[PDB]
Every structure is written in structure tokens, then in C-alpha cells.
Amino acid sequence: HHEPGDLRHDLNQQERATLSSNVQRFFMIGHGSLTADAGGLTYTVSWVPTKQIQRKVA
Amino acid sequence: HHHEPGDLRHDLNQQERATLSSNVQRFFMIGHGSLTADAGGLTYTVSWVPTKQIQRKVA
Amino acid sequence: HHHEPGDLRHDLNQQERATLSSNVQRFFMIGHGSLTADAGGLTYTVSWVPTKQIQRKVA
Amino acid sequence: PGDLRHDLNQQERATLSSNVQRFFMIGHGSLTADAGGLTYTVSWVPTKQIQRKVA
Ligand SMILES: [Cl-]
Ligand code: NA
Ligand code: NA
What we know:
4 copies of one chain form a homotetramer.
Chain A (H helix, E strand, L loop, with lengths): L12 H16 L4 E4 L4 E7 L3 H7 L1
Antiparallel strand pairs in A: 1-2
Bound molecules: chloride ion and sodium ion (2 copies).
């Protein structure tokens, strides 16, 4: 799988999996923005993650 | 009692929503989209063409 | 286990998609299309007329 | 072009051509058609080394 040079580059699997879950949950409970264009869909959401992760990415 | 936003999720059924949430989760895990440090926190953004059944509805 | 977008790729067979992926990798290496910055990250976009066979499937 | 590839070296540009190629196959991005022909677009964050350069 692709290894992007964004904030996931500094997180371990557990931490990345915690964040993947955050995003999936937010999508289900109505948070963020799902929009469509010519291309397809874009989902965007912002949040403050748990402190353990927040210290690492903030 | 979850918020029900008026974005594209407004046009989609529960199954369609659950499928897309799965796309978003997996995309996060497989390194797609962009995870940046925003003002106070994180922003995750990802773009994709959904599977055919959903594509029919959104296109 | 890959994502199966409902875009034109939905309508193409494995070999036609293989060929197009090659067309795209080639175009990138020879200066075609446009590689630009943000969205957070990179966007690459390229337009082209594919072979007559693929052409008929996609129009 | 005088886009980002202008400033990227051969290893970097090859890496990205491989990203683009793999993303096409794994279903990421958007393949659409016009009266023209086909358009493929995909966005992504490259490996740190390249992301550090283009951001
Ligand atoms: Cl948000
Ligand atoms: Na896609
Ligand atoms: Na086109």
C-alpha cells in the first residue's frame, strides 16, 4: 500500500487504525462534507484526535 | 440521534452510506487522500469514484 | 481486494485497463498532462484518444 | 512542461509514474470520457522525500 508523506508517515499502525476509524465514524454520524463533481466524490472532515495522537501531529 | 447533513449523504440510503464509510476507512489505511494538520487539528480529505450502483445515483 | 470505481474502468476488461495504465505511466514520463501541487499533495491529469477498440467501449 | 516534473529528478519522476500507474489499476482517481477522448485525474501525497520538495 502507498506510504504517503503526510501526517500518516509519523504514526504507527495502531494510531493510523484509530484515525481510520475516526473518519469512518464521522462519515456515518453526519460530520464533514461529502460533495460530488465531474470527477466523483470528495469527503473532507476535520477533528482533533485523541491526545496521544494530537501530541504527535500537533 | 446523529446529525443528518444536507450534502450528498442526503441523497443516499443506509447501505450506500455504510459502503462509502468503508471506502473512506480503507482509503485512509491504504495511503490515499491527504491527512494534514489544520488550524486546531487534523483534516482528512479523499476523492474517489464510488462503485457502479452508487455512481449511478451520484452521477 | 481493490476498489472498483463505477467510472469508465468499470466497462473495460483487465487487458484494456492494463494497457491504459501503461498509456498513463508513459504520458507522465514524456511530459504529457499536468502535474500540479495542492489539494494537499499532487494532482496529475492527462487527456488522450485511446485505441479504436477501447474508444468504442467508452463513447 | 514547466509543471512539477520540470524540477523533479529521474528517480522521483519514475516513482510518481509508478504511483499513477498503480492508482489506475487499484481503482483510484477518475477515468472519464468526452467528445474528445479519455481524461484520467488522480490526487495523492507522494513519499515524504518528494512531498517535502513539492510542498
Ligand atoms: Cl469537519
Ligand atoms: Na476512484
Ligand atoms: Na475527456
